[PDB]
Structure formats: C-alpha cells, structure tokens
Design an enzyme around this catalytic site. Sequence first.
Site, PDB file in Angstrom:
ATOM      1  N   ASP A   1      -2.751   0.946   4.365  1.00 54.76           N
ATOM      2  CA  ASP A   1      -2.902   2.333   3.961  1.00 54.76           C
ATOM      3  C   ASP A   1      -2.563   3.243   5.143  1.00 54.76           C
ATOM      4  O   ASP A   1      -1.927   4.282   4.969  1.00 54.76           O
ATOM      5  CB  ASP A   1      -4.341   2.629   3.534  1.00 54.76           C
ATOM      6  CG  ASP A   1      -4.556   4.001   2.892  1.00 54.76           C
ATOM      7  OD1 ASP A   1      -4.462   4.998   3.639  1.00 54.76           O
ATOM      8  OD2 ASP A   1      -4.810   4.020   1.668  1.00 54.76           O
TER       9      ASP A   1
ATOM     10  N   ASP B   1       0.841  -1.185   0.000  1.00 51.04           N
ATOM     11  CA  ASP B   1       0.000   0.000   0.000  1.00 51.04           C
ATOM     12  C   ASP B   1       0.886   1.247   0.000  1.00 51.04           C
ATOM     13  O   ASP B   1       1.514   1.567   1.007  1.00 51.04           O
ATOM     14  CB  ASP B   1      -0.884   0.048   1.248  1.00 51.04           C
ATOM     15  CG  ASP B   1      -2.142   0.908   1.116  1.00 51.04           C
ATOM     16  OD1 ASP B   1      -2.007   2.034   0.591  1.00 51.04           O
ATOM     17  OD2 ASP B   1      -3.211   0.420   1.542  1.00 51.04           O
ATOM     18  N   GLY B   2       0.906   1.920  -1.142  1.00 52.95           N
ATOM     19  CA  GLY B   2       1.749   3.092  -1.305  1.00 52.95           C
ATOM     20  C   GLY B   2       1.208   4.273  -0.497  1.00 52.95           C
ATOM     21  O   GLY B   2       0.060   4.254  -0.055  1.00 52.95           O
TER      22      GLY B   2
ATOM     23  N   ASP C   1      -4.253  -4.259  -4.860  1.00 58.03           N
ATOM     24  CA  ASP C   1      -5.276  -3.932  -5.838  1.00 58.03           C
ATOM     25  C   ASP C   1      -4.781  -2.787  -6.724  1.00 58.03           C
ATOM     26  O   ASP C   1      -5.574  -1.969  -7.188  1.00 58.03           O
ATOM     27  CB  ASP C   1      -6.566  -3.476  -5.154  1.00 58.03           C
ATOM     28  CG  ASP C   1      -6.465  -2.148  -4.400  1.00 58.03           C
ATOM     29  OD1 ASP C   1      -5.999  -2.187  -3.240  1.00 58.03           O
ATOM     30  OD2 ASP C   1      -6.855  -1.123  -5.001  1.00 58.03           O
TER      31      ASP C   1
ATOM     32  N   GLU D   1       4.530   1.529  -4.785  1.00 57.85           N
ATOM     33  CA  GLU D   1       3.880   0.230  -4.718  1.00 57.85           C
ATOM     34  C   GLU D   1       4.886  -0.882  -5.020  1.00 57.85           C
ATOM     35  O   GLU D   1       4.926  -1.894  -4.320  1.00 57.85           O
ATOM     36  CB  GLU D   1       2.686   0.165  -5.673  1.00 57.85           C
ATOM     37  CG  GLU D   1       1.508   0.976  -5.134  1.00 57.85           C
ATOM     38  CD  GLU D   1       0.443   1.183  -6.215  1.00 57.85           C
ATOM     39  OE1 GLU D   1       0.905   1.427  -7.394  1.00 57.85           O
ATOM     40  OE2 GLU D   1      -0.760   1.112  -5.922  1.00 57.85           O
TER      41      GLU D   1
ATOM     42  N   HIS E   1     -14.456  -3.551  -2.573  1.00 55.13           N
ATOM     43  CA  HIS E   1     -15.730  -3.944  -1.996  1.00 55.13           C
ATOM     44  C   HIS E   1     -15.508  -5.067  -0.980  1.00 55.13           C
ATOM     45  O   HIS E   1     -15.950  -4.970   0.164  1.00 55.13           O
ATOM     46  CB  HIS E   1     -16.729  -4.324  -3.091  1.00 55.13           C
ATOM     47  CG  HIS E   1     -16.552  -5.726  -3.624  1.00 55.13           C
ATOM     48  ND1 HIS E   1     -15.901  -5.998  -4.814  1.00 55.13           N
ATOM     49  CD2 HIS E   1     -16.947  -6.929  -3.117  1.00 55.13           C
ATOM     50  CE1 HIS E   1     -15.909  -7.309  -5.005  1.00 55.13           C
ATOM     51  NE2 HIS E   1     -16.559  -7.884  -3.952  1.00 55.13           N
TER      52      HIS E   1
END
Length: 155
Positions: A134, A10-11, A70, A48, A124
């Site tokens: 994050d 997570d960048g 993702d 990332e 989702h």
Amino acid sequence: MLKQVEIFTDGSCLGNPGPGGYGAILRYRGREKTFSAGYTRTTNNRMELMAAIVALEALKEHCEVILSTDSQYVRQGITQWIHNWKKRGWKTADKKPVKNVDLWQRLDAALGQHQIKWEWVKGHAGHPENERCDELARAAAMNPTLEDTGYQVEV
C-alpha cells in the site's frame, strides 16, 4: 531467499476514476522486484489487475506464482465472474464482450500456465508486507507518470 515468484498486489487509486496507479511487491529469483506505475485516470479495480498482470507479465518464464491480496474485484472477479464468464465462453448474459476483457484475458490466460496460490487475507491477519505494498501504491498515487490507455472497449 524464497525461491518462488510472489505477487503482492495493492492498488493506489484514490478516486474512481482518479489520479492513482498500482503498486505491487514482487519477489523473484533472489531479487525483489517492484512495480509501481502512475496513471492519471483509472479505477482501483483495474489497477489491482494491472498489478497482478504486470507482475505476471514481468515474469520471463511462466513459473509457480503465489498471489497475495484481499481485493473484492479479484475475489469476485476470479471466483465468481470468470467462473461463470469463462464457462459460458467468456461472454455476458446478453451475449456481449466482457468489461476489461483485455486485461482479464492477460490474467486468466497467464494464470493458465503456472501454479497459482491465491492467498486471501482478511483485514485482521494482515501482514506488514501488504502494508508496504500500500505504501508503494500511495507513493505511486502521488507520482503520475503514465496514462490510462486500456480504459475502453470499443471492440
């Protein structure tokens, strides 16, 4: 205790480029390792990669790894850009060096050791762990303590 290597990337790139970094939640041998650096000027895409790469690099033994993310840069980069680039022979259409080839190579080359499990997750059925990734990212984004060195390709 999950006896497996995990790389939740997570960048933490706020800009493009911008003062950010890259945070990833690592799950290693009975020890949850974290990798949240702080750059001054870098792209989310790169960051990332930095997460996936640094994580892999952190590994002191190329063993099974289950990556979870993702990112489009990766989604396409991997199963679009590398599929074509690599095949062609790690080259462009007009015969040229790849962008961020160094970091890419580290990944691709690294991936070519252990069992890769690409856990693609949509926005989702996302997990809380990802959210935490994050979180770490943001924490790093607001804590620059490095410099973007590999932001060029003079070749």
